Each structure stands twice: as structure tokens, then as C-alpha cells.
Amino acid sequence: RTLIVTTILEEPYVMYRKSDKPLYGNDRFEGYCLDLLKELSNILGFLYDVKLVPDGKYGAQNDKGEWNGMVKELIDHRADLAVAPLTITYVREKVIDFSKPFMTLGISILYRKGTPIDSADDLAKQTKIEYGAVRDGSTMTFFKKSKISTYEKMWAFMSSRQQSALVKNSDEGIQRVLTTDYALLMESTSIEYVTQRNCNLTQIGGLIDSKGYGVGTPIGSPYRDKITIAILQLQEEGKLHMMKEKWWRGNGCP
């Protein structure tokens, strides 16, 4: 049987391809995650049908404890795999079986160039520069749950004023950084992508934490361990490195 793959539009992982006519099926899409799925399919010998997650969410819980997003598609067996920049977190790993990571990353800061800001601590100890994250994503959750003093202080700020410092999506965050005195807490792989395309922006400081993106599968899936072993082969062959360079290299920023 052909596997159903849940995913989400997110540059440069999954994008609509450009054409002169309406597109259908897997031909709608291109990006790093499409290349990853062609390599996984090459090694493992499955066919697949890519399906955008109907609610347009990655996966978090509502106040009843019920999941949404790609994570919920896997829980409910409406997808076999999720292939997206789906952060491997404690809360999600309890409810789905993630492969080992195909990409490693951490939270960092996207801000304008030319300023004296150098770290999260520099942001935490002040209130003139606003800062926030995408609402309900794993970066926001990291701040919400942290018991590290600096990160607790930052969460107090971000959550204040009915969460006015948060944004609904990364593109909104990026425009806010570009327009106003605002720093976005963002996963470092996305910061790399953005700062190679907008030379007025930069990463501030290093990575705050360390985590990965993995392919999601339902708990008990026979595909999880097969996909992990395929990812390790692709990593060791230098294929994942090549695929990242293909999709991230920009017009170049100093």
C-alpha cells in the first residue's frame, strides 16, 4: 500500500512548485522534505501520497488535552508519516514515534544587524526591544516550560499583554523584525535560511538549546526504525548535507 504523508507548507522544506498550469498530487510540491521523501522511498521501496495537514498546524494540545496538526493525523492513523520541520520534543515523542533526526538545530535569535545586542540575556534584562516567538510552536513551549531564570523572565515578557509579543507565523515575525524594534526567537535552521536572503538581518548569539527534526510515525509503526536506518545511511553518505546546501544557499550575505 501507498503511504499517506502529512506535511505543511514551510519554506524551503515544502513549497508549491511554479508552473503555468494547475498542479495535482505530489507534483504540486518541491523542497528539502520532498527530496528527503524521494531518498527515503528509494531506500525503502514505498510509494507515497503527500497530503497537506487539513488544519495547517504542526501539533500541540488544546485545553482538553486533545492533539491537533500533523501530530494528530498520525495519532488517528490518517497519515503513515509526517515529513516536515517537525521538532522532536518531549511532549510530542510521548504520543508519536519519531525517527532519529534528519536535521539538528536549536532556538536562536533573529534581529537586525549593527546593534549591541549579543545574547538572550541582553534581551531579558530590558523592555525597550520587544521579542517573541510563533504562538504555540515548540519555541514558545520551550519558554513556557523553562525553569531557567533568564528564560522564565523572557516568558513573562512574551506572555504579557495578552501575548502581544507573539506572532502567528514566521513570516509575520520576520516582517516585524524588519519594521519595528523586535527580535524573533526562531529555530536556527530557519534563521540561516532567512539571513542568507535578507542581508539586513542576522542571528544574535548561539543556540539556546539543541534538538532535531524527525519523521513522525504513529506509535508502533513498523516504518519508524526503517526510516531511522535510512536517515543514518543518508547522513553517512553526505546526502543530507548536500540536500541542505541545495535548498539553503542564498544570493549570499556577509
Ligand X SMILES: C=C(C)[C@H]1CN[C@H](C(=O)O)[C@H]1CC(=O)O
Residues forming contacts to ligand X in the complex (CB under 6 A) are 10, 58, 85-87, 133-134, 137-139, 170, 186-187
Sign of CA dihedral 36, 43, 90, 151: negative
Residues 70 to 99 in contact with Li ion, rule: CB under 5 A: 93, 97
145 binds, among Li ion, ligand X, a copy of itself, none (CB under 5 to 8 A by kind): a copy of itself
CA distance 113 to 204: 9
Residue 51 within binding range of Cl ion, rule CB under 5 A: yes
Question: In angstroms, what is the minimal distance from the CB of 10 to a copy of itself?
Answer: 21
Question: Is 101 known to sit in a ligand binding site?
Answer: no
Specify whether the CB–CB gap between 82 and 73 falls below 8 A.
yes
Exposed, middle or buried, 112 (CB in 10 Å: 0-12/13-18/19+)? middle
209 binds, among a copy of itself, Li ion, Cl ion, none (CB under 5 to 8 A by kind): a copy of itself
Cell of 3: 503511504
Q: Are strands 201-204 and 107-112 parallel, antiparallel or unpaired?
A: antiparallel
Residues 95 to 154 in contact with Li ion, rule: CB under 5 A: 97
Q: Phi then psi for 150, rounded to 5 degrees?
A: -60, -45
Question: In angstroms, what is the minimal distance from the CB of 24 to ligand X?
Answer: 26
Residues at the annotated binding site? 85, 87, 92, 138-139, 187
Residues at the annotated binding site for L-glutamate? 85, 87, 92, 138-139, 187
